[model samples]
Each structure stands twice: as C-alpha cells, then as structure tokens.
Target: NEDLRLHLLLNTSVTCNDGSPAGYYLKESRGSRRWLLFLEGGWYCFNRENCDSRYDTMRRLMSSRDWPRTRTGTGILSSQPEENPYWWNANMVFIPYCSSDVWSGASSKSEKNEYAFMGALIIQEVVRELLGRGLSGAKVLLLAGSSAGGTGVLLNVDRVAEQLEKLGYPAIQVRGLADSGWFLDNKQYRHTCAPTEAIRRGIRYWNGVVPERCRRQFQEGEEWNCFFGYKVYPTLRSPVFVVQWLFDEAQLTVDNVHLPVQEGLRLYIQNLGRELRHTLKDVPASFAPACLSHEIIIRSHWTDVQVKGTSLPRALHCWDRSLHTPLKGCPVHLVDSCPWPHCNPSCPTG
Candidate 1:
C-alpha cells in the first residue's frame, strides 16, 4: 500500500539548484517506530561561476532530471543486519543533495533566477510529507547525514524537532547523528581561508539562514562564521553525536595543505587534530578518530574506525543507550590522544 520509491513532493515550489523538482528516496520498514533520515552530501559552490562549473562537473547533484527510478540505502542506512547493526530495521530515508548549499540555502526559484537555493526548504517539506508515510507514529527519529548532510543536521536538527512539535507530534524524540561534518575554522598551511571564504560568499548568494539562536551570536556580516562546526555546535538545542576524522581530507584539500609536507604543513595537520579535540571536548557523544579521511556512517566499513578502542558503531550504540541505558548506558566522547595522521590501527589503508 506504500509507495516505496523516489517520492517527489506532490505540491511544493521548492526546487534544486538547477530548478528541478527535489525529492527523496525512501525504504520503509514496517512495524518499526524508529526512523533514520540521512541527508546525502555533495560539494557546494559559492558563486555563479562556481555553480556553472559545478553543473557541468556534477549534473545529477544540481538537477534531478535524470535520477533513477529506484535507489538503495547503504552503510548506516543499510538494511543488512550484519552490516548496519543498530539502524538496520529503522525506516531509512536518503535525501538527495540537489540544492548544493550543503542543505543550508533558503531562497526559491523565480522567473529571473537561474537557480533555486532551497535545500533547507526541501528538508522542511520532506518532514511535512513524511508525516503521512508512517512518521506520525514514530517514537524516535534519528536525523543523520554525512559531509554536507551531516553539516545539515547541525544546522537543522532543532528546526526539524520544532517543526514536528508544531505539527502535533511532541512524543517523537528527535536526535542527530552527524558524521564527519565537524570541520574546523583553522588557518590553512598556505594562508588561504578557502572553506571560510566560500561560506562567506555562499550565505549571501544563497540567502542561507543559520539557526536563530546562533544567528544572534553573530553580527550581520559574520553569520557566515556560524557555518563552522565550533561556532555553531554550542547553539544546537538537540542532542547530536559527531563523528569526524582527525585530519579530514576535504578540509585539508580546501586549505591547500597537500601531503609530503614541509615543517609548516605537518604542523598544520597537527593543529587540525588539536583543534578538533578542542572543539569537540565539550561534546558528550563524539568520535574523533586519528584518521585522515572524510565522511563515514555511509561507508560499508563504517564500523572500522575507533577512538579510545571503541568503534564508531559501538560508540553510537552506547550513545543511544544513554537515552535509555543502564550499563546505565554510557556516553562515548572518544577522541584520539595519539598524535599525527593515520596513527590509528583502525584507519582504512588504501
């Protein structure tokens, strides 16, 4: 009786970057009150020039014009009980990354506009529609994503929870499982604030809105800074668990700190680790492994990385238990004390 397929929003003006109708892929599991929603991640563009180039490089992300009729969930969204132990039975949803603002944009398309910056609205609309798709009876809704999707969780978890409440679903407990989105606002080895600069331009161009609580912390011109993990994490009202590699490859690339380093570049890597620890210190349920990688929770080997000897799956399960635990269930704040990148034995070798 359920349409377990790519469900396009039936009545919505919100669209993707290329003015295509945005949609999500759903895999429904009956008799389960738990739902896990994962936002897909892709890179974003700051300017029209960048967007024009991006459209050519990754057309599917910018437009859902040719998306397949059927999509499969993987890794954390995987239904294989052996692979995705905890979330295997939960209702899994994979939200596409067509808007390309890292799911942060709010502006809509108009006759004069070539693109529609509506990733944020897509999320809101998705939840609005999911209410009829058995979400209204949900007991726990775990909003999760990797990279941009993970970052989106940070930006919109509270918003989603609040929306559910407004829609008369106060019993649903909304928690977040953000993977590899804890990007640092540190200085690059080559002295370019590429990541920060992009967001600075991106916010203005896309009309991106940060959470109101965090927005107040910044002046008008500085709202872009809130995009940084350290800057925005403090204002998040919902409980979120962060899984970040100590030396993220994407952040390293944006900062122009390629490997086989000089003294300064090596120090920059060290600084990235130190800064991740500093930013993640107060986060009660986080996994910062000493690996030079980006994005997890969506990989087949999501359970490979460990911090303080506890794998991500273990840490995540433990964190979930704290909500209803007794081993009293313990919260896992697993950051690696080891120095340097690729130091962890659990790190993927390739």
Candidate 2:
C-alpha cells in the first residue's frame, strides 16, 4: 500500500474574525494519475458535522462504488480530530462544506468567508506542491456540492480557470462535475432552506416518471430561481457534467432550498453555453440514469430525504402508482432519470 501513502495537515484560516480558517476539508489518495475531487453537499454536511457523524456514510460514498481513488473530504473547524496530527499534505483534498452554514455569515458567501477563500488558497498550494513533487502537469476533476458548494464552484470558477490557464505550464488540465448543485438564481434561496415556486413548475415540466403534485402558494412568475451562482464564471475549460435527480426535495424544492433547482440548471446551461459549445455541456444525453436510488449510505443509514417516487424503488416520493418506480441501486437504466442522455445538444438556451 505504499502507493496509497498520504500526509494530512489541518490549519485554521488566518483571515476573518474567527482568526481561524473555516469549513471541513479532508484529503486521502491512492497516488494514482487521475484525480477526482468529491465536494460534499452543505445541507447534508451540516446534519453530519464531524467525522464521527459522517465517517461511515462518507467512507462508503468514497469507496469503490463512487468516483474511485485519489479523493479527499472537507469540513470546517468543528472537524478537528481528538488525536493524530498531520491533517494536511494531501495529494488530493475534498471540500465538503458546501452550505450557508459553513460560510459563517448571513449570506451564503459570508458564512465561511475566510474558509471559502481558503479553498482558492489551498488549490494554489496543492498545485505548487504537486508540481514540486514532479507532477508538472496533472489532470484534475473538480466536483462540488451544487447548492452552497455548488455556488462555490460558480463563484470561484474564474479563480480556478485563471489559475489553470496560467499554469498551462503543461500537464495539468482540470475538469469539473456538479451534483444536485444549488446554483441559486433567486435571492430567496440564498441563505434559507425553503423550496421555491420556480422549482415546482420546472420539475413538473421536466419530471418524467414523477407526476406533478400539489403546487406552492407563491405565484409562478414571482419565482426567480436560476443557476445564477454559476453565471459568474465557468470553472472548468472542459465540459462540465451536471448531475440532477428526479425527487430531490431538499436541494431541488424551492421551498426547501428556497428556489427552483431546475431553473438554476437552465441558467447554468444558458450562460455557460455562451462561452463553450460542445465543450461546455455534459447533461444526460438520452435516457441514461437520472438518479442513483438507495445509493450513498453514510454509515448504515441512507441520509433521510423528504419525497421519493412511486416506483417500488422510488416509492418514497409519491402515492401515484404510474409515477412510482420500483428500481433500486445505481440508476444506470436508460430512463427519465437521465436528462440529455449522451449527446450534448447545441448550447441549450432559455
């Protein structure tokens, strides 16, 4: 296992009022050529604060089934270990604090103000370290949570893009992927965790197996949900794969996330399309796997979710039999779950 050797270093952010770096960021790797950065979602991370709460759940997620090798995890200061030093020096680091709570302020950006910046700082640090270790050029996969961490991807894309382009010093090409990212278009879902009207309508229109249920009280036009978070900058020069689920209530629900997840995805495609065409889109082509059900168990429990589908496999979401799905395990089936299915259509517009 010498190839799997890794070093860990935990440091507090030196800026902001806390006099400490914020968020939970961890590192682990098998010292392989490829790199996959797994950014854990915020809402989920908040519920499972430290390693104790998230260790088992995350271990399975990072295990052979998920992304596979050269991975790491992240959280804020509360993520301190009781013993064992050396929490840094990871070939690969994962930032898991992708929520408003991690930011440490009223707004999503301000919550972990210093720590968010730290992500940028650490990227630079790691790049240098990698180069010094004779990794002149490396291909990296930047993956983050869509909502808070998803926003982090959007807000910091320019920073990373700029850095990568400059380091065109050869060998290092970084790509990205986002999962159920909360690219907030509306101001309502910024720091709040409530569903919005935009999400309901978008899902109704886009939802395949899941039939539209009760509508929200808010007016349709009033909803301003969109993936504005990503509008700021396109993080990866290569195509960015967007992964969405059919019955994601907390992140997709406007009220739960205070905005429409569908609207956000549309915006991301719209803005990013302008910069890059075939190179920018990675949505599901045909009826690939829309979602992976009963997947990613932290510890022994599948993180509790609100609504599932009618299929015995997806029966947790609704009572509608036609809409219900009996499918389980990885959603590799060519069904409604997969959106664009393989072919990245012409830059999608509004």
Candidate 3:
C-alpha cells in the first residue's frame, strides 16, 4: 500500500457502531483546492442480530480497532492518469464504513450505549477538521462513494454544503458522484419486500436523519422513503452525477435471483432494467450501463465500461465541466439502451 495516511478521529462522540473511533485516510495533493472525499461502502444491518453477525464476519467495517495505519487508493481514488483522468490530482480522503447506517444516522449511541450510530456526525467532524487542514480554501468538494457510501453521498451532500455555508465557506462548490446507489424499493420476484421495511426499522434503530426538506413531503410514518434514490435526488441541493448498472448485482439478491440464474428469472431482471431506465430518465447527469455489476467507479478497469459511446470517466468529466460552466455537449446523461443484462460487451465478469 502507498501513502494514504490515516487520521483517526479524536472526539468521543463521533465513534463507530462498536463504540470505536471513526477515521479517514487522506492522500493529499500538493496544493489543490479540489477534493474528493469518498465514503467506503458496506451494506448495513438494521437490527442487533444482523449487526452482531456483521461484527463477527466483518469486524473491520463495524469497528476501527483493527484498521491499517496506512493504505492505497484505486479507481477514482487512484493518483495515476490512466486510472482516474479527471480528478486524479484532487486531494483524496477515504472514510471507512463503520456506523452501518448508510452514513445517515445521527444518534451518538443506542440507549444502552451498545452501538454508536454517528455517521452523520462523523462526516461533519471530518469537514470541520479538514477546514484547518487546507479544506478552508477548498474551491470544489466532490462527495462520492460506492453502494451504501454512494447512497450516503445522496443523503448528505446538501447537508454538508449547508453546514459549510453556515460555518462561513459559502464559496465552496460542493458536488457528488454516487456509484451503484440508485436503489429501488421494488417488490421482489417472490413478492417479498425486505429492504424497504428493514430500512424503516433501521431509521428507528439508528435514529437516521433524512434530509429535512424531503422529510416534510413524506407522511409521518413514511419518512424512511427518502433513503431510496428516486425519492432523494429531487431534494439534493448540489449537482450529482449518478453512476449505476441497470442490472445491479446487489439488487438481484433482493429479486431472489442468483448468478447462473434460471430462465424464469429473466422477466424479473428485465423489469428491473426497465425500472432503472424509467427512473434515471429525469436525471440530467448519469452513466447507466446495462450490466449485472455493482460498484462501478472503483474497479481497476472501470474505464472499459460505457453507456452509449462515452465511458464513466468521460461522462463524469463532462458532468464536472458542465457544473463549472454550461457547455452544449456537457452533462451527458448516458443510459444504455440495451434491453438485457450483460448486453454491454465491456462488462468485466465480476
């Protein structure tokens, strides 16, 4: 691993789910005001039993006690021009997944202090801490991540910009690039709907804070709907370019479809692709490839995949340029018109 230096968080309150300190790794650029703060993604545990299981199998995710002193970053976080062309020179900060709240939880801890769901607070502290460490003069901050981390970016981007403005740095241009986070709350192939209901329970368990403006639009008991991508995007204040695979592998599990799937599952999977296309139609900046993959921006050869003729990096570059100033061909919303999964020849067999 190369030098992405670790910075363990100090505050007692902004801890992880296991009550361990939360932290981030920084691969600082020489003197760039551009920043890409990425959140690490691991699926969440809505309740105690699943979280307990997570601790046993995925301790590093829940507790930072066993984290490395330093690490390397790849894909979008890569410093090499070949891997990440657009923001390769930007200051990179990678925050690990710990709270298992999709970085939305606001409570410091559960009643017994058994778990600290402070992902929302942790993100705030990192910004506050970074302000002194050169982020005070930051011109651009691209808050980004994959899967759950990506979802967190959607959930928190506005709040981050809002806080920075209130804290006297309204000059900063905050943006987002969320990968594989455009999850739909569709009914499963077997007529089951676990994730949405589980998420509703998770909001209570984690005391998760949905964006205030969006929360007001929902009914009292249905505030948890904001976690879904289709519902949350309209509420975001910052410009965000969504990167999603039409046939998302992680979401396939929800549809009760497995790899080497049976013929009967084709319609269900195709329906998912249809839904993805329909929902993403309104998003102005996106790269939706028709592939059965998850986590689009981090893989080594993510450069290979494309929606239409433009690659993810290219689409993102166009999106970023458009954000700076309006250009005619800028903000390319590339969605694969291919009707089936694995239709894109560039998809690597993950």
**Per-residue lDDT of 68-129 in model 3, one digit per residue for the tens?**
98878788988888988778898999999899999998876656657878888888988888
- Ranked candidates, highest TM-score first: 3, 1, 2
**Largest lDDT belongs to which candidate?**
3
lDDT (tens digit, per residue) of candidate 2 on 237-280:
43344433332333334423322348765554333223222222
TM-score of candidate 3 versus the correct structure, residues matched by position: 0.96
All candidates in order of lDDT, best leading: 3, 1, 2
Runs of candidate 2 exceeding 4 Å displacement: 1-17, 22-31, 43-92, 96-137, 144-147, 182-236, 256-350
Counting clashing residue pairs in each candidate, in order, gives 2, 71, 0
Better of 2 and 3 by lDDT: 3
lDDT of 1 by residue, 124-181 (tens): 9999888999999999999898888888899889899999999899999999988878
Using lDDT as the yardstick, the better of models 1 and 3 is 3
Task: Give the TM-score (vs. native) of candidate 1.
Answer: 0.95
Q: Which residue pairs of candidate 1 clash? A: 325-328, 326-329
Question: Lowest-lDDT window of 10 residues in candidate 2?
Answer: 206-215
